[PDB]
Design a protein around this ligand. Structure first.
Ligand SMILES: COc1c(O)cc2oc3cc(O)c(CC=C(C)C)c(O)c3c(=O)c2c1CC=C(C)C
Ligand SMILES: COc1c(O)cc2oc3cc(O)c(CC=C(C)C)c(O)c3c(=O)c2c1CC=C(C)C
Ligand SMILES: [Ca+2]
Ligand SMILES: [Ca+2]
Ligand SMILES: [Cl-]
Ligand SMILES: [Cl-]
Lengths: 116, 115, 116, 115
């Protein structure tokens, strides 16, 4: 699959399991159209969001529901969510791994982009 | 000022200067009402965005135009922008410092909340 | 293997390939004894540093030669190296993945610790 | 002061206060000669470590006792400490601000180098 998200927890030193996220694609009219959604597995990964043929050029947003993750562990975190917005496939098809590292008052996000 | 934003550049080891951002508050209809903006100073800081009276409880978004910053440096970036979305003042007024550390394919953001 | 290191490059959005690192273990006399070494593969990972039986309880240091990585790309970075020092297996055997995300003037490091 | 260290806590969203650290310079025999130390203030900052005259070229290490900080909060940490090792002043004297963002199983460190 050309899009994978991995989420880690910096407090427990573990994958962040069962984290929900929704992916949107910017439409011709400039609205955010729903594109895919899912939750992280026991390895903190979410695979199978899309296919090479469906994942056309465009601007995509991944909104990761980090607040519900922390609240289920008892913590009231700073962020409502962690958002990643990016233009994809502008130079032809690529594979994207987006990683998010979570703490109650901080997050980091990174992308590794590879040419298939 | 109960809201300050500081932006750092991890490629050059410097404050990220002249970075534009806009601040929004979530409206009753779930849309984002812009209410403040500015660009970072030579210290990488943006002060004076709001006042204690105006900065009431609500959900706020800071959208930092990281892509324009990297374009200005001739460096290809991954993200369109860096967004920070948070509920403010849920226990009473707080002073917020939001810091963002930028790289072309990564960013970090952190909040320091003081009383 | 119970110890794996992954290194990513935040400037290029890629694994950090051919990054050298050395692992040390603190001896009874408080010196750092060489333990293992290696370089990252094309996926930015270094596997096979040790075995469950050899990786006894102790304090371990991983020194990742990030300066030579950046210098080979033309960049004079801030850090001489990225070091990770930790006590391992204090509560019984665990598997450790240590991730390092590199920029010229910043690095982050994280550990995921799992119970085999 | 050409060297300042600032430490932030990503769990509590606060400066990391009373964090101890030691600064070393690499000696001719490849050993680490300690020469300064201190603990962070209520702002998470440690100033006054050295002077412009004393802070000559060399390789310097800052060892931050992150484990003691997390132990004081009752939180199990991964790292023994956070080390920052760098060559200073290789092009002339610079002012260095080293920032460290702490979580129990992760840290980040960044340098802002100003002239
Ligand atoms: C990139 O790591 C840094 C950095 O280099 C500088 C930083 O500067 C800060 C300055 C601040 O005033 C405050 C508020 C502290 C009060 C007591 C109100 C900060 O939180 C920071 C920083 O966090 C800071 C950081 C860490 C930020 C990251 C790694 C996203
Ligand atoms: C820089 O953000 C990333 C990233 O881009 C890729 C990452 O890849 C990882 C792969 C891993 O196998 C593991 C172990 C997970 C298990 C369930 C054993 C990882 O922790 C990561 C990553 O942490 C990772 C990260 C985050 C690391 C940082 C921000 C220093
Ligand atoms: Ca949400
Ligand atoms: Ca070295
Ligand atoms: Cl990856
Ligand atoms: Cl700074």
């Amino acid at each position: 699959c050309p899009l994978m998200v991995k989420v880690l927890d910096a407090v427990r030193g573990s994958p962040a399991i069962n984290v929900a996220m929704h992916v949107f694609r910017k439409a011709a009219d400039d609205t955010w159209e729903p594109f895919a959604s899912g939750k992280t597995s026991e390895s903190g990964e979410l695979h199978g969001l899309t296919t090479e043929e469906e994942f056309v050029e465009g601007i995509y947003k991944v909104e990761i529901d980090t607040k519900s993750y922390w609240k289920a562990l008892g913590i009231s975190p700073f962020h409502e969510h962690a958002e990643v917005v990016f233009t994809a496939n502008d130079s032809g098809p690529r594979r994207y791994t987006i990683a998010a590292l979570l703490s109650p008052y901080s997050y980091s996000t990174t992308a590794v982009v590879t040419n298939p």
